[PDB]
Amino acid sequence: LYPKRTKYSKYRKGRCSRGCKPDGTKLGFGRYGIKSCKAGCLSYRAIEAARRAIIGHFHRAMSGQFRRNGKIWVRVFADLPITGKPTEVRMGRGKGNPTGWIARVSTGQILFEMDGVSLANARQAATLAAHKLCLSTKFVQW
Amino acid sequence: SLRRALLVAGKTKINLENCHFITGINYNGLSVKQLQELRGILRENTNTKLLVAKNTLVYKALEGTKWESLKPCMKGMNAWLFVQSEDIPAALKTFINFQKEKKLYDNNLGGAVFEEKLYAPQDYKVIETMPSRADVY
């Protein structure tokens, strides 16, 4: 969830894009998946929160998970260190102190991919991530 | 599906060829336990085959002949009985003690068929006694 190892740091914010690489994607690693309809930004805590939601969901429905595992990939990783000044300070005199990473999310990336033996109880966890995430996603599959 | 209904019609028809006497009875209102008791007298004591089957489906089985006289007995809920050919009646007599006894079940009975002709309960003996079709005529 963190580019913990040495990196240049203090990244230029950079404006968000109107599109992704143009070829209509396919799925990387699993049967069912989810994709971002609209670009934007997601914070590491947000993505990890969606992951908690999903893992804990299958864990809850251990009834469909007690077989073995219900494997899931999350394919977005925090990239840019979002920095910020304190709550009361004169503008300027430097840049913010790095206070949380962010991850550019384009118009077609696959956020979640997985093969939960039940299509029903996979589409059922589809809609259970856009609640805890910033953007509007879509239930896709292989 | 259609393939299921064709197979149900064919199996009912093959039973209709190897029997010699048929009884058609209204069986609405009746508990499952009573049906099991009826089957025991029907099969263990009289060797008979019972089927509840859809009226539209039964028409196609009787269409093969000779039970075309049983066409108007398929209005309302139908339970059919096919007795073995080497066996004469017995099941018809049982379906009567079993109808009369079981007033909580309100079975309206129906018309049975022997000699290829459906016969009235009062005329059951007269038709059975005369072997030829329209022998009295």
Partner: protein, 198 residues
Amino acid sequence: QTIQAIPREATGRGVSARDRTIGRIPAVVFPQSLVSRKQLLTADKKQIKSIIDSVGLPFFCSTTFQLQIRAGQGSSTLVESGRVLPLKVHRDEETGKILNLVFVWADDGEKLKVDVPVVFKGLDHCPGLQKGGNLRTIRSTLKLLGPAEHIPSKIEVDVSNLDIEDKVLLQDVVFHPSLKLLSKNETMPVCKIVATSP
């Protein structure tokens, strides 16, 4: 499943835009040769969008297809026809719309490089499967050379004997002669199973 088409004389934005907006797909047939040369068509978007879902295979392009290429008026006029394979469907990211249909000719029986999936079948009974064995199906679809005539409809692998810690490589697939794999070395596993947690 004859697809219908009407030509177009177009390139990039400007015109394909109006085609899409009235409902029409800019598609291209061409022969396996070079410059590459066949007419430049438009399928009907209704025809194609319904067709990919109907097959139920997001790689439906595994199947040879047949084109009426109407040149004239009305519902059609019987004109030049096509026996072409779909080698590429450019599905839009945005929601699932369609942008481009790529058709290469194979009418002659000439060979092609095509896509076939590996649908898992024996999953009902398998010793590891009944220990619970689950897996990472490294390869779900592959590319096979071969003629136009005998083209398979798909490859339905036989995983019934996926031993507890064993795997179906590429060699074990039920090919046909002249459909030489030959484009991947058979040392690529197409599944496995492992006893992870009961």
